């Protein structure tokens, strides 16, 4: 992230979210979680399409 210093391999830099959903995600944690959710939705749509073709 642009806030993170260069060459950081720490879990916070790499996206590990210490906080719970109740305590709340940090902005960096929220962006990384958004990346994960985006991949999830794209994969879900692709899975639906592929499985429809496969079933047919």
């Amino acid at each position: 992230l642009p806030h993170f210093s260069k060459d950081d391999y720490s879990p916070e830099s790499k996206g590990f979210v210490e906080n719970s959903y109740l305590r709340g995600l940090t902005p960096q944690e929220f962006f990384f979680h958004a990346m994960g959710g985006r991949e999830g939705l794209i994969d879900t749509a692709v899975k639906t399409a592929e499985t429809g073709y496969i079933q047919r």
Binding site: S5, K6, D7, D8, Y9
Partner: protein, 118 residues
């Protein structure tokens, strides 16, 4: 390897062997100038290159905010202000060995205990 181009026509020199006295001289084709070769090795090829573990280290490189700052110090500078980067070369086999540059020594100091080369 050292690559030599002839001075008169600025074209690359090609190796040539004098058989009678058994030595290697560099002769250029674009112009007739021939010279004695100082280095024995005509061609080298590194399957594994440590070259480029540090690339483009400048004095100004010590000032950039993006680069991280470390507590450790080189024995030569004896100044802690330093920049540590992982190897610029992108390899399948890459060492996470920190390379540090401090401005006062302008000397690169390497975290790994195994290798003290260069």
């Amino acid at each position: 390897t050292t690559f030599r181009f002839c001075r008169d026509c600025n074209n690359m020199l090609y190796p040539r062997e004098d058989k009678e006295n058994n030595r290697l001289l560099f002769e250029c084709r674009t112009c007739s100038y021939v010279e004695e070769a100082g280095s024995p090795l005509v061609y080298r090829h590194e399957l594994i290159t440590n070259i480029g573990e540090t690339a483009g280290v400048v004095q100004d490189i010590g000032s950039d905010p993006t680069l991280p700052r470390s507590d450790r110090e080189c024995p030569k500078c004896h100044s802690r202000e330093n920049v540590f980067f992982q190897s610029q070369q992108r390899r399948k086999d890459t060492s996470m060995v920190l390379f540090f540059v401090c401005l006062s020594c302008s000397h690169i100091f390497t975290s790994d205990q195994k290798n003290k080369r260069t």
